[PDB]
């Protein structure tokens, strides 16, 4: 268990294997690509009905992205977790079929492990010879959405680096091919960051409201309730509303962003919590990682009610 460290790349690997392998009538693990280094990226699926009644929505969760956000990758195992090991919420899986993807970007996060623990690029290079000192690029900055028109640096090196061009990396890709397989039935996308405890939806780029914005905010607002009556006293507030106005910035390229612009009703990007203000908002104290993904599990699990009820 030791949800009281955050564990190496190859353990969370381990994990989704584990469950695959144990619970394979309702666990599927899916290698989908090889990273840019070399290794494997994975997701589990998880269905009662091994994804063939296309009735049930489909609910995706991903993490990881950023390789310094180290609280993002156990928030989405606990979900497989709750999802398979302790079901406490039987409807989630009589009413969805899932998707997680506990690590998007595997170079990076093995990166801060060895090398450098604020690291949040992804590691590739390419034909341009500058890219073998400039490693990686910004993976919320990847996706084909207003793809590099702000929130970025055209060097290669800077870390809100955009890329070669959209979805220029691998991982980026994979998590793009999930978004398009299971466009259909998605009734909500979210992908885990840190820090700030903040639930964020589009338009991220101009801070301006999508046609979808009452669901989103009363979905947030309903998330952000939830975590807050099961967090610690000693923990912040959940902000939930627009991520431009909220996160202070514009930001072109997310996946949140790119998700709902191709048609998914409720996309958000949960910037979990962090104690400190600087580099350490992003290694939230240990002894609280089970209790984070305890409670953050609680706003998933009122998210996914509510799109699920929005969706029909
Ligand atoms: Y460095
Ligand atoms: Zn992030």
């Known amino acids: 268990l030791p949800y009281d460290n955050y564990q190496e790349l190859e353990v969370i690997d381990e994990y989704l294997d584990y ?11 899916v290698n989908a690509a090889e990273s840019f280094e070399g290794r494997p990226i994975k997701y589990i699926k998880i269905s009662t009905t091994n994804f063939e009644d296309e009735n049930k929505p489909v609910i995706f969760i991903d993490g990881g992205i950023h390789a310094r956000e180290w609280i993002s990758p156990p928030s989405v195992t606990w979900a497989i977790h709750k999802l398979v090991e302790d079901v406490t919420e039987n409807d989630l899986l009589e009413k969805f079929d899932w998707i997680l993807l506990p690590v998007v970007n595997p170079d990076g996060y093995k990166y801060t492990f060895t090398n450098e623990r604020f690291w949040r690029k992804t590691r590739s290079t390419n034909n341009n010879p500058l890219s073998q000192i400039c490693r990686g690029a910004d993976g919320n900055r990847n996706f084909d959405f207003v793809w590099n028109s702000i929130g970025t640096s055209n060097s290669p090196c800077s870390d809100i680096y955009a890329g070669t061009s959209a979805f220029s990396e691998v991982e980026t890709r994979v998590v793009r091919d999930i978004l398009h397989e299971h466009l259909a039935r998605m009734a909500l996308y979210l992908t885990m960051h840190s820090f700030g405890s903040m639930i964020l939806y589009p338009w991220g780029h101009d801070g301006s409201l999508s046609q979808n914005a009452l669901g ?11 975590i807050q009556s099961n967090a610690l006293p000693n923990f912040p507030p959940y902000t939930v509303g627009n991520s431009a106005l909220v996160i202070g910035y514009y930001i072109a390229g997310s996946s949140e962003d790119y998700a709902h612009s191709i048609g998914v009703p409720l996309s958000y990007t949960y910037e979990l919590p962090g104690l400190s203000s600087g580099w350490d908002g992003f290694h939230l104290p240990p002894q609280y990682i089970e209790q984070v993904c305890r409670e953050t599990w609680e706003g998933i699990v009122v998210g996914a009610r509510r799109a699920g009820d929005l969706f029909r």
């Open 19 to 29: 469950i695959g392998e144990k619970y394979p009538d309702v666990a599927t693990v």
């Open 216 to 226: 989103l905010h009363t979905v947030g607002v309903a998330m952000a309730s939830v």
